[PDB]
Each structure stands twice: as C-alpha cells, then as structure tokens.
Amino acid sequence: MKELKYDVLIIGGGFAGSSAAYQLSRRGLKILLVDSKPWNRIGDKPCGDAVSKAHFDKLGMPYPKGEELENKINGIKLYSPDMQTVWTVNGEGFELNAPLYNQRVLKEAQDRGVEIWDLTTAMKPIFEDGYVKGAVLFNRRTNEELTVYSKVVVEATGYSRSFRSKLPPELPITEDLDDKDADVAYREVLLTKEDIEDHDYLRIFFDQETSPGGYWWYFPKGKNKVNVGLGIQGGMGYPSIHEYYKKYLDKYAPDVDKSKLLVKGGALVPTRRPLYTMAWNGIIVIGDSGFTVNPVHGGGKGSAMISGYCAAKAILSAFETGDFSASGLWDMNICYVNEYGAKQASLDIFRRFLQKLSNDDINYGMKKKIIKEEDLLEASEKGDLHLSVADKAMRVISGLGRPSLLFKLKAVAESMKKIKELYLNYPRSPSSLGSWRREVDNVLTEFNKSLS
Ligand SMILES: Cc1cc2c(cc1C)N(C[C@H](O)[C@H](O)[C@H](O)COP(=O)(O)OP(=O)(O)OC[C@H]1O[C@@H](n3cnc4c(N)ncnc43)[C@H](O)[C@@H]1O)c1[nH]c(=O)[nH]c(=O)c1N2
C-alpha cells in the first residue's frame, strides 16, 4: 500500500484532538489529523455543551463567537434532593454549538499548516521495535488504505479509546477503565413552551434516586431552548439510563415541548484520575481516552483542551532532544498533572464520597450550609478541600443525631490532601512510575475501605 511520513499523527478530531493540532501548528512540524466522522459531524458527540470561559483564556484558545456560541452563562444553580435548598454559583461560561466551534478550531489549524482527513479511521496501530510508529488509516472518501508513519501518535479517540486499546497490554498506556470509575450520561435538546427563567444560569439537580452516582442538569441554550439530561454511575447494576430519563424528565423539565426535539443521545463519561502515564514510547493520550474529565461534575471539554496544550508542549520538547521515548515525552504528564491532573486525583477521592451520600445527607448538608460558596468552587477549581474548611463543616455535622457518612468528611479531606501531594510529586522518570502507581493505588484502596 501507499506509505506517507509525518512528524505527528493525531487520531481524533474532538476537543482534545483539535486543541492539540491548534497548539502545535506553525512550529516546524508536519502534522496530520484524522477523524472517522464527516467534517460537518465532527465533535457532535452527545454533550452538555457547557464550558467555562477560564479554559479559553488560560490556553490562548479563541473565544466561541457567532453561531458557535448559543448562550452566555453567568452562573450555576445547584438544587437539593427535596428542592428546598438552592445554591447559586457565579462564573462566566459558554453554552456551545460544539460541532460548529470544533470545526473552526480544525479549520484554523488547517490554515496554519495542519493537514486534516475526514472520514478517516485509524484501524491498525504500527508497533515496531517496542515503539509506536504510526497507524494504518482507512480514508473511505477516497477508499484508500494508507500506512502513515509518525514519530509521535496523539491518541484522542474519545471514551471509545479505539486505537490505544489495540496496542500490546504490556504498555502502561493501555490502562483500561474500571466500570465504577465512570458514569453513563444521556441528554436531549428541546424547545420550551414557555421562556426559560434565568436562561443565563445552568441548573444542576442532586438526587441519588433519580440519578444515583451522578445528577440531573438543565442547560439553557437560549430563551426557549434547553439541554436537559442526566448521568448515573456505571458498574453498579442500575437499569438503563433512558429509564431514569423517561421517568423523571417532567420533574426537572416540565416546560419542554416534547414535540420539538432537536437532538438526542448519550455516551460514557470517565470520572477518575487521568491515565497514570499519558505518554509512552511514540504515543501521547489525551481527552476522554486519557480520562481527563473532572470526576465531580463530569466536565471534560475544558480539560481536554488542556491535555492537548500539554501534548503540544511535550511533543515540541521531544523534537528538541530527538527523544520520542516515554522519557522524552514525559513532560506531557508533568504539564497536565500540574494543570488539571493533580486536581482530578483529589476529586477522584471526593467523588467516591459524594456518590455514597444519601439524599438525607445532601439535604442536611445544603440547608445547614456546611460550606459556603467561597469554599465550594475553591474545591471544584483547585481540587482543594482545606482542613480549616473541613473542620468548620464538621462542627455543623456534629449537630446531627443520626448515623451518617458525613462524619467522615475530615478523613476524606485528609485523603484528598494526601493524594494531592502524591500527584504533585509525580515521578520525574518513567523508571519510577511503577513505584508511584502502586502508592496511589494503596491510597485509593485504603480510602475505599474507610468509607465502610
Ligand atoms: C451526555 C454528556 C454530557 C457532557 C459530557 C459528556 C456526555 C457524554 N461532557 C464530556 C465531554 O463531552 C467530553 O469529555 C469531551 O468531548 C472530550 O473530548 P474528546 O475530543 O476527547 O472526545 P470526543 O469523543 O469528542 O473525541 C473522539 C473523536 O475521535 C473520533 N475517533 C474515534 N475513534 C477514531 C479512530 N479510530 N480513528 C479516527 N477518529 C476516531 C470520533 O469520531 C470523534 O470525532 C461534558 N464536558 C464538559 O466539559 N461540559 C459538559 O457540559 C459536558 N457534558
């Protein structure tokens, strides 16, 4: 067959893949990006389309303008199980036309020198001499089966992880996803009969009965258009998520017009720490495939762009030394952990706590205000549950007369602090990965026992 040689091969054109191609362009590298979907359908994976504005500023990513921005978000309303307590969290964000913005990032990168092939599926990985040296692509637009050699393969195939799962199991980069370390989510976009009250505010509904292990959401894309859905923890035995959706839709969205359904669908969402290593010999993994999603609120489009940013930095550093080994691309792990990875690991522990709280615990926790707004987003933006804040919350929990998991809040905050420092002390060399990984597991396996 035909053989082509590129510097970098990016597999997947979503938020992770496109951001990687954007940050890498115009810097002396021959780059190729592929995606199984047609160009007009790239990035149409079922999503809440809600991304913080801060992610666009930090990474130097272009703001979503025009049709790419459906609605401006100024805050989030958090609802208690009994609907009696409603917390208000402020912060600027964007309700996106995800495919429209994702395609502009691609098009701009294409104008900067990056070659893009749509309707192209990475089938077989090229693994020779213990290194990832490219992939066998199938462009069904031209019905060609091309063999593309590359120094570094960027894996951004989404949650499906279709490429890196075909690599040898001896590679640490082939770490799989445990069923309980992920959530299944489903969403629909409908038009509303009445105008949406506070359409600049996202609504998030907490309920372990209507959405066990996750939550319901109500994301206005306009004055009369809303993204409504839910998410539940997988590997627990729960019935189909569509049953939960169909049963409790009217409770969280009675104003929707069910005859004006625009889109519908769902997908798997990783809710854990990132891959222990997101880079190995001739390969970097980013996005859902590298488990980049915030374990608490399930937002992984912002962190995907972060992983792509760190992928670009690591690759440029690799070519700067002529080293495409794991030790050469190791800045990918260092960059991402400091940027978002260390936060994930901490929230990974906090997630396991929140998923095991009853509705009575959540109702009590919100009404009695165990934590204020000043400390809440301080936890979901930095991953830090300060020991001073945990003490102030425990003094409130001490006024509870019934047995509850809430009484272990201080122990949780200490475990989060421990695993936080453990991730900030990420192994400098791949030779220390094995030892560090087993230490992390010991923290997690111990914490899982402490919740019983
Ligand atoms: C229902 C629901 C709701 C939400 C969310 C998820 C879900 C399922 N998320 C998470 C968010 O959708 C997700 O984490 C990001 O899109 C991750 O970006 P990726 O590009 O890695 O994924 P994505 O899945 O978009 O990337 C995969 C891409 O690669 C392509 N591909 C796959 N295999 C391939 C192969 N072998 N060869 C070539 N191409 C291949 C696919 O076709 C696709 O285009 C979210 N996030 C957030 O921050 N805010 C939110 O509000 C939500 N809400």
UniProtKB/Swiss-Prot annotation:
pH effects: Optimum pH is 5.5 for the reduction of GGPP to the hexahydro-product H(6)GGPP.
Cofactor: how and how many bound: Binds 1 FAD per subunit.
Keyword terms, alphabetized: Disulfide bond, FAD, Flavoprotein, Lipid biosynthesis, Lipid metabolism, Oxidoreductase, Phospholipid biosynthesis, Phospholipid metabolism
SUPFAM superfamilies registered for this protein in UniProt: FAD/NAD(P)-binding domain
Temperature dependence: Optimum temperature is 55 degrees Celsius for the reduction of GGPP to the hexahydro-product H(6)GGPP.
Pfam families from the UniProt entry: DAO (PF01266), GGR_cat (PF22578)
InterPro entries: DGGGPL_red, FAD-dep_OxRdtase, FAD/NAD-bd_sf, Geranylgeranyl_Rdtase_fam, Geranylgeranyl_reductase, GGR_cat
EC id: 1.3.-.-
Family: Belongs to the geranylgeranyl reductase family.
Protein name: Digeranylgeranylglycerophospholipid reductase
Species this protein is from: Sulfolobus acidocaldarius (strain ATCC 33909 / DSM 639 / JCM 8929 / NBRC 15157 / NCIMB 11770)
